[PDB]
Every structure is written in structure tokens, then in C-alpha cells.
Amino acid sequence: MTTNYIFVTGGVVSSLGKGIAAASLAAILEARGLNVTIMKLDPYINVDPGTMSPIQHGEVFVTEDGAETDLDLGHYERFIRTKMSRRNNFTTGRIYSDVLRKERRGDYLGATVQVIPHITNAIKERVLEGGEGHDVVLVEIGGTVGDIESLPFLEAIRQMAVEIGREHTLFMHLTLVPYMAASGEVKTKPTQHSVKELLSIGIQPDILICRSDRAVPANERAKIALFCNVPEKAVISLKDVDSIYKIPGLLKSQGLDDYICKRFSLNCPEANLSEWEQVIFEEANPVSEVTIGMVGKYIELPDAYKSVIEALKHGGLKNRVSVNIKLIDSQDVETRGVEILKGLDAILVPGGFGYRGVEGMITTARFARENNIPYLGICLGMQVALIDYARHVANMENANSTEFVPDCKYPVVALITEWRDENGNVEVGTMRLGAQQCQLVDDSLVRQLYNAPTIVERHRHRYEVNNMLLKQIEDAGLRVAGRSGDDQLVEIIEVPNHPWFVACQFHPEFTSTPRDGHPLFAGFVKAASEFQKRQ
Amino acid sequence: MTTNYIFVTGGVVSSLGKGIAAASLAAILEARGLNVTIMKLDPYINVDPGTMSPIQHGEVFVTEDGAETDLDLGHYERFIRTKMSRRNNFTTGRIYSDVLRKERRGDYLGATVQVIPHITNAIKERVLEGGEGHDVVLVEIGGTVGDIESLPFLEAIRQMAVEIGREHTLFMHLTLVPYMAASGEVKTKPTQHSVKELLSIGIQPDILICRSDRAVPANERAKIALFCNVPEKAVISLKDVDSIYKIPGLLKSQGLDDYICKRFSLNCPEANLSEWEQVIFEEANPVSEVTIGMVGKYIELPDAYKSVIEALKHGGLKNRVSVNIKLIDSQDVETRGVEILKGLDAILVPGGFGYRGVEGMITTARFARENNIPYLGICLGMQVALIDYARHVANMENANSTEFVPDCKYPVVALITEWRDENGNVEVGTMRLGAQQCQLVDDSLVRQLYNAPTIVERHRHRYEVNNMLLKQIEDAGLRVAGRSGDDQLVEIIEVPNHPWFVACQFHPEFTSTPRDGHPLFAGFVKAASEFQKRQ
Amino acid sequence: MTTNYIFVTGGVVSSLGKGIAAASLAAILEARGLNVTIMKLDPYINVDPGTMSPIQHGEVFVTEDGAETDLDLGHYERFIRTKMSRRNNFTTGRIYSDVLRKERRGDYLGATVQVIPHITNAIKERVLEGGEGHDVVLVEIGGTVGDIESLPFLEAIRQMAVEIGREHTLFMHLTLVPYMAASGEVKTKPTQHSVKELLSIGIQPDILICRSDRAVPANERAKIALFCNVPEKAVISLKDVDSIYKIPGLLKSQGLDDYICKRFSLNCPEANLSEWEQVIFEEANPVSEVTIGMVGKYIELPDAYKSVIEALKHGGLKNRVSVNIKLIDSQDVETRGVEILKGLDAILVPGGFGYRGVEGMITTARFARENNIPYLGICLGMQVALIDYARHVANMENANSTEFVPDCKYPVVALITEWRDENGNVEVGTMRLGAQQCQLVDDSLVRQLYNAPTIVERHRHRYEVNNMLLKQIEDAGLRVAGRSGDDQLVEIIEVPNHPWFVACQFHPEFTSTPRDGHPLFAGFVKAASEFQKRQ
Numbered sequence A, B, C: 001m002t003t004n005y006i007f008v009t010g011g012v013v014s015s016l017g018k019g020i021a022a023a024s025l026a027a028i029l030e031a032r033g034l035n036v037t038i039m040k041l042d043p044y045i046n047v048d049p050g051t052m053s054p055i056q057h058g059e060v061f062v063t064e065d066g067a068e069t070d071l072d073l074g075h076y077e078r079f080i081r082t083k084m085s086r087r088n089n090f091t092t093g094r095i096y097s098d099v100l101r102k103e104r105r106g107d108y109l110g111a112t113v114q115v116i117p118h119i120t121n122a123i124k125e126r127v128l129e130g131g132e133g134h135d136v137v138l139v140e141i142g143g144t145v146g147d148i149e150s151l152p153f154l155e156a157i158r159q160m161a162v163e164i165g166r167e168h169t170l171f172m173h174l175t176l177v178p179y180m181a182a183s184g185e186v187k188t189k190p191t192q193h194s195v196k197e198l199l200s201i202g203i204q205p206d207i208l209i210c211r212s213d214r215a216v217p218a219n220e221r222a223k224i225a226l227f228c229n230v231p232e233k234a235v236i237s238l239k240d241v242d243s244i245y246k247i248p249g250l251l252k253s254q255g256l257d258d259y260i261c262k263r264f265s266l267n268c269p270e271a272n273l274s275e276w277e278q279v280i281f282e283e284a285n286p287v288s289e290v291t292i293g294m295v296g297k298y299i300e301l302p303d304a305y306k307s308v309i310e311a312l313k314h315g316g317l318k319n320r321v322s323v324n325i326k327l328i329d330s331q332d333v334e335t336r337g338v339e340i341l342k343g344l345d346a347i348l349v350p351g352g353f354g355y356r357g358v359e360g361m362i363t364t365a366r367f368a369r370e371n372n373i374p375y376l377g378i379c380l381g382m383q384v385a386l387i388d389y390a391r392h393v394a395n396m397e398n399a400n401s402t403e404f405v406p407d408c409k410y411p412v413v414a415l416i417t418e419w420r421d422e423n424g425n426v427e428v429g430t431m432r433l434g435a436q437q438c439q440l441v442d443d444s445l446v447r448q449l450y451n452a453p454t455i456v457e458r459h460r461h462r463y464e465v466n467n468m469l470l471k472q473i474e475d476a477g478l479r480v481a482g483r484s485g486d487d488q489l490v491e492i493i494e495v496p497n498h499p500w501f502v503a504c505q506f507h508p509e510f511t512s513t514p515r516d517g518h519p520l521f522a523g524f525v526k527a528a529s530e531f532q533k534r535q
């Protein structure tokens, strides 16, 4: 069977729901038994998000293969069970970098290297590479139609549609249908103008996804159909919803997947969304409520912790608990003290880099440990927990990471090459990215929760637990719950004299889904519920 | 000095606030002592709105000279004291009608008559004729930039800017800056795309009026300025406000009138908005509250009663009464009965044509009269009041208008040329439009409200009170309060055994302003307040 | 079966060949046995070209039914045998006139009359009415894609394509592919930009007709196809040719009619272009050469005499005579005298209105008569011939038309209602338009040329031969060769003491075709050939 492509574009505005819409449509098609995948084409010049600030861009998502990618690939993995890799995300930067290397080498044989065909050919080659061996490939085009930055992507997919044929390619265009308070009407005019802009680049949209703060009524959908060369049944209402997990159902009920399967001549059973119906049911019917403090250094942009916030929500679903997530600036713990950590049923310290706000997180880890408040530490969260214990239990004064204080006496966290003891004595690829097997210690809390001896979780860090100083911290009562590799690096630590204290080096939020949840976050939210009840 | 033009255009959507923004800016310039006028260019093909139904594009406004115009001219008269005429409003229909007339009789001397220059020349001639010897002329262009229907208007004003020069012409462009709930940000992208659309038509905007449901922050305004070749100070925030009377102050506070006066080299004093501050103060400081029911056949589109709704609010300002306007379908009175007129402090029956919903209005007038509930009838409102009194007091069974039942025994309302008595005996440009003198009767409510023997009000009707059946209705207790012309046509009637029952042929709502109010509406709202307390 | 539409548009420039391309394609489809018609949509505001001067947009063509139309309908009748009528040509003026008429009398029932749907509906109705029960209807859109004036036509045909469906609608778009002298290459960039402009209006072209001063090579056609979403085989080369009669063959050789018949599912035999091959053969194989002078007042724009120039060429085909047409200003005859009529084998004085250049034509008719030079006078050409003979043979000094000198003693030409003799004595819809029967006199040139007692030819004139002064001119030797109607109006005159002197009221050029020729023009060109040899 020929691979089919759905090119997903956005008009009028960004922040429109392109990624969620693509992920939601992919979920419907996977629920019909189809082999589906999604890829994100980002128009920014960064070769990849590896170097990009969480505050500016949102979280850096990590795939099994260790690619640093757009957070949209997080949405993809939470909506479909196809595993994402490097091939599922690429930037304008990547494309120009590759073409420039081929040019400077001499691969183009003295030819003038042009946006067309050289840049467009490089785009098409990466789309085909990502799409090969799937029934349906959804290709999310970042940016807004009419902007300079996405034109090469739009010209590339236009060429692909002609080459491959309209029997195996569809253009799905999102637009904004805004509400005007004064007249009490939703407005199709931006959709009319956006479709003309998309046509002016050479693309006739097949499907229009109308985003609005309410349902787009039949009169407005008919008006959009009339002006845009699109049949009325291919003009789809996608209103603002209180849960994105409802969107697969909303799109199915408007026959979007029927329309797509008809165009692609795919004979497949009706979409079974029973698992999504269960997720929606669980979320709408919590029995208890908990407040969980997320104490970090990037709270000014919540999307910095997209996968963590979702993983906590998924913890709620499995326990039938409504999780109130309180984003707390760790620098406010440094300034105003531990007073701002009161009325929390649990505390989570997520990932981060740089010393700014870290002392606040160390204080937070101490507060949670001493007051028996459920604690989950992720990467930096497990560093500050180890530092807390080293300082305040093992009596290793001013214990720190070499990242923050390079020449500290007790570098409990440091690079493998930097490993030294308190006397400066030493033993006789630094960045860990992507999936790695971790061995769980018998009788550990995590061994019970994961219900297995070994687990596969994803890393994004280079600063490790210093094995030379570990024995002293272990003797002071701290437990090693997980290890990995030949160098037996510490992956998980637990404080046993505590209802629920777990900290891990890996990013468990990256394997959490609404349908399958996550053993660690489910345990954490349960502990939060049990704590809330005891008060 | 040379006449200055401000061309006001709208992008992204209609219902944007072009009329209110133009009127509000004109109010600031008038408060600086400038001779200012406004005109509306409507892209619809109707020669004028005389033929258009109210539920289509709102009320048909009537000027002193009897022109049937866009309701925007109502906004203009409520914001500036410059009186509107036929030359302050014209349509595409009017332009093509005039050019086709000239062409068919041979005025173009065998020339090919073209959109340019013949249609655009006709537009420029009407703009100049309406612009006269004013200091500043605001020219509001109907429709949305990028649509087919407004392109001749836009090409015309582009040519005017070049001819007159940019020292005496400004382009003021309104755009939508919508709020995205999920991201919590207002979006400048529609403004960016709309300005490029306006530029592609040959117009560089000088001023951007950014419409949003909240203030457009400095960052967003600075971004708009960066992409649109517009100075940051010429990017103006116009949020949704609870009162349009506040808009002159909000525009002044951002220096819009300073920018305009600087560009036009107009040395005039700072705007004194004391009159608007007073209107706002009155509105914000009511003493009591009333619920006035408006019972009509066009309530599905409130803009059908734009001037009447505003006139009732002005009535409130003058009494410090907060008027809750309840729009009631007259057909619901026919179905569900008088029960839906309960809990009303007053009843207004406004203008209308056709028999649909009229019997409900006659029932409504009966209820108001019999239960001593304050009543104001405008045009059709007076007809139904005369029919009510004819049927139920003067014992003229099945009394009606010839408009509704042509061959009724008692045509109490009819064309002057249809006037007959109950036996079919007779006496011996029916359409009355615009300002006409009315003589008031010595001992009437209206004589003491207007405090003058004669008044000037505006008509839009052909169906008159039948003088042949009047004397019998007068004997039954109905009072004629106002008459006009050689044919002594009945203009105002009153039911004297009632706290406040007045009904007029003319449209008093067209001469009501927020600053000067209206004697009749002030009296009506006062009567409503007295009934409210009395109960 | 369902009627099929080919919408013919032009990009980049006007004067592109839309009319000739449409007519040429229609000739191929007719040669496949298809029932085919063509209509012209003109974006000018003139209700019809009746009022337009010839020097503006060329000759006013007249159909059988007396419609005054664009000269394109002349191209249509010269290429297909389907007779044109009023419904094969309409203007923006006609559309707005009709919609304004309907609106003012209340046919739209209080609706806001808009470009869409009211103007576009009116366009679609006239296209369908003209399209009738034909197999294929070619719809030529005047103006250039991207201009304001054609946007309603383009929106209308876009809606038709959607409604009727793409199985019965094709978009054929003409573009300019200009030659750059310095680089020696033809440029596809204007085609690329024009197609994007057409797409931005909502129309994807199916066929691209590439106009150039030479063949568009495979590389350029392949490039156009790549950027325009058009199959390579649907990119057609239409070079500048020495004969428009070759165009049907050139389009057929590139498979254009095959592509169209495949898209429309039309099973019809291969086009037999034998009739066109014969015309081309005749044209390429002349035996002798003649110089015919055309003496008129509109020679500044040759298209003023489009049909007359073509009719003379058709006269050449039928005699195997190469006709060198010399355009001579009749005002130059007034200034420089008869000297500029030297070296002419024949003289044609065509139609015209107004006195400017008429005396030069009268002098021209005198020269042709006195020096036995073959003469054909059409309409004004006959008037000046009658005036010439009246003045210089019948001794009616200062004899003239009432059009030129209203109060002349001998008004030999005048309106029927102005008919008076030399003493001022009298007898007892003046505008004659379209096909009218003419009775020919037994012993006349025309009776033996037409070989019938009656003929049908087309009129466009109000000024008639004065029957009151005719008898005196007949006595002086002038022969009446043709008459018509109850008023026995003079249609044809001959000077019998002359090798070939004929002049007619009607426009015989409007019934001349390259395939069937015309008996009068064939005779005229033969007489020219005989004079050439005789000299």
C-alpha cells in the first residue's frame, strides 16, 4: 500500500492547536488499526532545541534514540503508540546546515544552490524518510501561512502533493474563527483571507479545522465552504475544550477520519475510542483533590514543564484524584523562606541547569524530607535531594554540584571525569541522552511501583552522583534504589524513613501517557492523596 | 486652510468599531474647536438602505433632509453637532447608478467607461462634495480590506491621498488583535497580514487602531509598529469598553488627536472632553433602576432599534435612572399572551412595516393602557395605540390599517388617498421623509415636555391617521396632542386617563443625543421611575 | 449529456490573444462534430458598446438580432458557424444595471444587495443562459487577472466550477512568456506570478496557454508545469503566427482538444481541419497582388475596421489575390488633396459617424468614380458616394447629410422624419440594427454577385437616403441596386458607367468568413485585380 500524507498547516495566528489537532487525528486513525506517524517541521534556525532556553521555547522533549526535539513530539507520544525518533522533527537550521555541508564538500558539482530545488529537495527527502513504511503520515508545518519563515516548507509539500498525487496527499489547514462580543457572532473572514493566502502559495486546502472559543455553527461552516473551494463536510469545528483528550471524539463525530479514509481509499473498521472515553470519564469524576507544589526555576513559562504537568494529571486519572498543580519559583523559597511551601499535599522539583534557584530547591527538598511531605525529584530534583541529605544528615558541609560550585570540598554531584573525594583524591561522551536500562534494587519503593527488576527511562544530563562520596551518604541512611551501566551510575535514590520520597536522574514524564499513566507519578499522586487525608 | 481627510478602513473582520472609532475621534477634534464632519461609504449595491429590512444591517437612519442612510450616521450625530445629510452617506449602487445614467445619455463622449477612472472619479467627487469647507473630514470605508466589494473605494482614496498630498491626508486602519485562551496572549499576526493586504492595494496606513477585548500591551504595539512601517506612537489600543462614551477619552490619552493635528499642521487648543466626562459620570451614578419592555417584530437583531435603545439610555442619564431594556417579540404576545409583559415599569412599541407581529403590539398597547403602565409608541407604535383605542374604547370592531387589512370597515390608519369612513364615503409623494414642523396642543404632556408650541422631528412613513374616523375616536376620550401640514395630519396622540401614554408618527430617537438627551424619552423614563416606586 | 464550460482568462497583459485562442479552440471542437458556442464577459461599465467610439476598443460588431457587441464576437463567427446573439456578450454595466433595476422595484425582498451573492448570481445566470444545450461553452473573461474590474467575473466562474463540478468545468489561462534580447531566453516568471494571482482569487488553472513571439521550449514548459500545479501536457505553446488561421492546427498538434475531450469524457472523432488547411493554402499561394486603399476617419486604431480588413483578406483568398491594405486618413485628402490616392487598385470607404473627415471621403468617392478606380462604400461610404454624385453629376450644389449640415438645401441623406425636398416640402426607432432582408434589382452588379433576388445583411445606422431627392439623382445616371422594407429605403447604389462602383447601407463585413468568403468583397477584390492588370 502507498504511504498517504496529511500536511497540517495553520493560518491567522500561531498557538492555534496544530500539534494537538495532528496528534488527535492520528489517535483516531491508530484506533482504526492504521499504522500512523507524525512529524514536526519547525521554521526556526536552531539546528535543534538542544541549546534552546526552556523559558523561551518550552520543554526540550527527548526521544528513545536521544534526539532533543520540539515538545509537540511529547503530544505525539501521548496520543499514539508509535515511538518518535530524530526523523520525526527537523528545523530550517538542520535543512540549511545539511545543504551548506553538501555544497562546501562539492556534492552539487558546481551548480547554483537555490531555495528551489536544493532546500525544497532536502525538506522532501526528510519528510519521505520519516513517512516511509506507514499507512498515514501527518506532517505538522510550524509557523503561520503568509509568514516568510515557512514558505520553503509550504513549497516543498506543494511539490510532494503533485509528485505523489492527490489520491495519497491531503492539505489540512487550521484557522481562527474569533468571537466578537458586541455582535455576538463568530467571524469566518480570517478563514476566507487565510485560505486565499494559502492558495497564493500554490496550496488548495482539502480540510479546514476551525478553531474558536465555541462550536462554529452550520451557517458559518457553509459560508467557509462557499468561499474556500472546500465541501461543507470537510469544514470541521474544533472549539476550545477543558481537556484535549476529548478532541479525538469531537473530530470523529464530525466524520473527519471517514473523509480521510475515503480520500486515501482505506477500508478499515470504525475508530474504537473506548480508551479515550475512559480517560475523559476518569478526569470528569475525581473522588479526592490534592495540591502539589512544582518548585523550579522556569515557572514563568509553564510549557517549560509540559510533560511533567501532564504526567501529574495522568497520576490523577489512575487514582481518581484532581491534582491542583501550584507552580512555585524556587528563588521565592530563597527570599521568603519555606512559608510559601505550606498547604502542599506533595512537592515535585523538576529538571534544570545552572545554579540560579538551586539553593531554594535544596531548602525545598529538606522541608519535604523533614516534614514527611511526599517528594519526587527529577534530574536536578534528585541532585538537590542528594545535596540536602549530604549537608543536613551525612554532615558534609556546603556539599554541592561542580556545575554550581566547581571547587567545593564535597562534590556529591559532578562529571565522571571530575569525581574526587573530600581530600581531592581520584580513581585510577559526557552527556547522556535518550533511553537507557536501569536496574531497580529489591525492596525499594520504585521496585514495587514499577513492578519489575529493570526499567527503560530517558536521560538528558551529564552531571552524575559522585560514587567516591556515595558510601558516606549511604551510611547516613540514604538508599540507592536504581543503578545503570558499567560505571554503576546512581539513577534513583530513596529516603526510607518517609511515607514517599523518590528522586531519579532520568525524565519519567517523557514515558507517561493519559491511557497507560506512569507507575512513579501514580504512586506520587496516591502518596499526595494519603498525606492530604491524614491532615 | 486646505481641507484634511482621515480615511478610516477596517481589516481582519467587520463589526470591528469603524463607525464608533470615527465618531469618537471626530468628538475629540470638535472639542478642539475644529470644523469636523464624517461620511460613510457603503460597499452594498442598494442605491440606498430605504428598501433594506431592519433585521439585515440594522435600523434605517433618517437625516433632516429626509435621506435614508446607514445607522453609522446615527453614531455621527450622537458624537458631533455637525448635522448629517444625503452627502454624508453613499453606496456602490449610488455610484454605478450615477455612472450608468451619465454613460447611457452620452456624457463620456464615446469613452470606454472603466472602474478606473470613471467609478473612482465618481467616488472622489462625492467625497470632496461631502468634505466641503471642513477642517477635517473622516471618511469611513465599509467592508473589510482584502474583499472585492471595497476595492473601488480603496483605489479612489489612494488616488485622493496622492493628488491632495500626505500633508492633508491620513490612513487610519482598524484591526482585530484577538485573545488566545490557551496561551493567554493577544495576537498581532492578523494586524501584520491585514496591513500587508492594505499595502498590496497601494495604501500605507499612518495610524493603526488595535481592537481587542483588553488593552494591547506595549510589547504587542511595538511588534505591530516594527512589521507595519507605522511609528509606535501611531499604534493605538482600543479595548472593548462598557460605554462607547469613554472612547474619546481613551483615544485622547494615547495622543491620537495630537498626532493628527501635528500631521495636518493644525494649531488648536487641547481637547476639553468635560461634556463626555459628564455623560460617563451620570451613567456611572444612577439613583434608581427601571425595566422598560421594547415590544417589536425585529428583536432578533437589536441594531434594528439602535437609535431607540440609545434614546432610552439618554432618558436614563437625564433622570439618573439605570434602564434595563427587555427586548420582547410581539409575536410571543400573540402566542403566550399578556403574561410575558409582567414586571415592566414601562412599554415602548417602536417602528415597523408589515402585519407580522402587529396584533401582539395592539394587545401590548391595550395592556399598557388598561394597567396604567407608561407607554411610548413610535410610528407603528402610535398606529397600534390608535387601533387599540378604536377597537376597545370607541367600539370600532376590527379597526385596522389598510397596510394590514386593506378592506376593513374602520381603516383608522390609511394612505391619504385611501381615506374613507365606515359607510365607504370619501373627502372632496405619500412617503413623508425627514424633518417636519409639528404643532403641539396647549394642554398635553408633550407641550410641557418640549416646552414649545412647535417642534421639528423626522418622519419615515406613508400610512397616516384617517381624519374621517378620528372625530369618533376623539369623542371616546383619545386626545390629539400634535398635528402638522395643510392636511392637519395627526402627529401625536395621548390617553389622558393614564399616568404617561404618548405615541408619535415621527422618530424622536433620531434627534436624541447622550449630551442633550430628548424631552420625550426623559419624560418616558421619569414616568417609568415613578411607576416603579408607586409599585 | 451535461453542458461543459471552458473559462478562458488572461494574465500578465491584455492584447494577449484570449479572443483568438477561444475562437481557435472552438474551431477544433466544432471540427470534432461538437455543438460549441463562445461568450465574451467585458469588465467595462458601458451597458453595451453602442455608445463607444471605434478608436477606443475597436469596431462595434453587430449580431443578426441587432445586438451591439465586442469585436471578439466577430472572431467567434469567423471561426465557428454557431451564430452569435445578445446572450454571447455582456458587460459589468449590464450586470449592475439589471441588479439595480431588480433592487429599486423590490425583487430582493429587503435583502442587502452584495457583490456576492447578487452580482455573482446575475453573472452565473447569464453564463448558463448563453451556455444553453451546447456540448462545450467557452467563456472568455475580459481584462487581466489581478485587476479590480474582473474580480466579480472570476468569483462567479469559481462558484460555477464548484457547483457544476470539475468533470464539466476547465480553467484555461493565457500568460505572456516574453523574450529578453540580452540573455536570449524566454521568461516563465510572469506565468509563475500570474498563476499565483489566479490561485489567490480561488482558481487553479487546468491549462496554461503560453503566448510568446516564438515557441516556448520543453524546458520552459516543464518549469511552468513544476511551479503552477499544471500537468506538462496541459502547458501549451501559442507563438505569434503570420496567420491566425494556423492557430487551430498548432493547438491540435499539442493535443489541447484531446486533453479537453478526455477531461469532459467526450467520445468524438479526431478534428478534421481540412477547411482551415485550405484557407492557409489559398493565403500562401496567391497568383497576383493588389493595393486597396481604405479611406476613413478612424485609421489611428486599425481594429476600428477589424471585420472590413478581414473581409478584404477573405476577398483575396477567393481570387488568389494578395491584398496590400493601405490605411489612408480622409482628413489628409482634405489637406494634401487627391495626390495621396495615387497607385491604388481599388478604394474602400467604410462606416463612421460625425462630419470630421467626411468631405475627404466625398472627394475620395469623386476620385474613384472619375478615374474608373474600383469603389466599395459601406454605410458612410454609400452616403459620401450619393453626396458626390448629387453635387458633381445631378448638379445639387452643397448636397449633404442632415447629420453634418442640418439645414442644407439638398439633404440627400437624412432621418426619415427629416425628409424634405429643395423647396422644403415633405411627405404625407429610426436606428436600424441587425439582419434585414434586401431586394436586389434585376440588372445590377450585386444581383449577379449575390446570385439571388433577396439577401440578408446587418445594419447599424439611422441616416437614410432621402427618397424625396432620389428620383433627380436617378435621372442623372445613378442606379438603385437594392431596397428594403415598406418605406422602400435605398440599401445599395451603383454607378453603371464604371468597371466596379458599389455602395451599401448594411455592413457586409459582418457576414464575411475566411472559409465561405463574401460575394461582394470577392467581386470588389476581383475588380481591383482586373484594374491592376488593365494598368
Ligand SMILES: Nc1ncnc2c1ncn2[C@@H]1O[C@H](COP(=O)(O)OP(=O)(O)OP(=O)(O)O)[C@@H](O)[C@H]1O
Binding pocket: A010, A014, A015, A016, A017, A018, A019, A020, A021, A142, A143, A238, A239, A240, A241, A242, A244, A247, B182, B183
Ligand atoms: N481544542 C483545544 N482546546 C483547548 N486548548 C487547546 C486546544 N487545542 C490546543 N490547545 C492548547 O493550545 C496550546 C497550543 O496548542 P499547540 O501547541 O498544539 O498549537 P500550535 O499551533 O502547534 O502552536 P505553536 O505552533 O505556536 O507552538 C496548548 O496549550 C494546547 O494544549
Ligand SMILES: Nc1ncnc2c1ncn2[C@@H]1O[C@H](COP(=O)(O)OP(=O)(O)OP(=O)(O)O)[C@@H](O)[C@H]1O
Binding pocket: A182, A183, B010, B014, B015, B016, B017, B018, B019, B020, B021, B072, B142, B143, B238, B239, B240, B241, B242, B244, B247
Ligand atoms: N471599543 C468598543 N467597545 C465596545 N463596543 C464597541 C466598541 N467599538 C465598537 N463597539 C460596538 O461594536 C459594534 C460595531 O461597531 P461599529 O458599527 O462602529 O463597527 P463597524 O466596523 O462599522 O461595523 P460594520 O462594518 O459591521 O458595520 C456596535 O455594537 C458598537 O457599539
Ligand SMILES: Nc1ncnc2c1ncn2[C@@H]1O[C@H](COP(=O)(O)OP(=O)(O)OP(=O)(O)O)[C@@H](O)[C@H]1O
Binding pocket: C010, C014, C015, C016, C017, C018, C019, C020, C021, C072, C142, C143, C238, C239, C240, C241, C242, C244, C247
Ligand atoms: N497567436 C497569435 N499570433 C499573432 N497575432 C495574434 C495571435 N493571437 C492573437 N493575435 C492578435 O493579437 C491581437 C489581440 O488578440 P485578441 O483580441 O484575441 O486578444 P485579447 O486578449 O482578447 O485582447 P484584449 O483583452 O485587449 O481585448 C489581435 O490583433 C489578434 O489578431
Ligand SMILES: Nc1ccn([C@@H]2O[C@H](COP(=O)(O)OP(=O)(O)OP(=O)(O)O)[C@@H](O)C2(F)F)c(=O)n1
Binding pocket: A186, A187, A188, A189, A190, A192, A220, A223, A227, B013, B014, B015, B143, B144, B146, B147, B148, B149, B150, C114, C115, C116, C117
Ligand atoms: N471575497 C469576498 C468575500 C466577501 N465579500 C463581501 O463580504 C460582504 C460580507 O461581509 P461580512 O459580513 O463582514 O463577512 P462574511 O463573509 O459574512 O464573514 P464573517 O463570518 O466574518 O462575518 C458581502 O457584502 C460580500 F460582497 F460578499 C467580498 O467583497 N469579497
Ligand SMILES: Nc1ccn([C@@H]2O[C@H](COP(=O)(O)OP(=O)(O)OP(=O)(O)O)[C@@H](O)C2(F)F)c(=O)n1
Binding pocket: A013, A014, A015, A143, A144, A146, A147, A148, A149, A150, B186, B187, B188, B189, B190, B220, B223, B227
Ligand atoms: N513577515 C513575517 C513576520 C514574522 N515571521 C516569523 O514569525 C515568527 C513568530 O511567529 P508568531 O510568534 O506566531 O508571531 P508574532 O509576530 O509574535 O505574532 P503574534 O503577536 O500573533 O504572536 C518568527 O519566527 C518570525 F520569523 F519573525 C515571518 O516569518 N514573516
Ligand SMILES: Nc1ccn([C@@H]2O[C@H](COP(=O)(O)OP(=O)(O)OP(=O)(O)O)[C@@H](O)C2(F)F)c(=O)n1
Binding pocket: A114, A115, A116, A117, C186, C187, C188, C189, C190, C220, C223, C227
Ligand atoms: N516561487 C519561487 C520560484 C522560484 N524561486 C527562485 O527563483 C530562482 C530562479 O530565478 P530565475 O532564473 O529568474 O527564475 P526561473 O524560475 O528560471 O524563471 P525564468 O523562466 O523567468 O527565467 C531560483 O533560485 C529559485 F529559488 F527557484 C523562488 O525563490 N520562489
Ligand code: NA
Binding pocket: A018, A019, A072
Ligand atoms: Na505547538
Ligand code: NA
Binding pocket: none
Ligand atoms: Na458576516
Ligand code: NA
Binding pocket: B018, B019, B020, B072
Ligand atoms: Na458600523
Ligand code: NA
Binding pocket: none
Ligand atoms: Na508571538
Ligand code: NA
Binding pocket: C018, C019, C020, C072
Ligand atoms: Na479581444
Ligand code: NA
Binding pocket: none
Ligand atoms: Na531562469
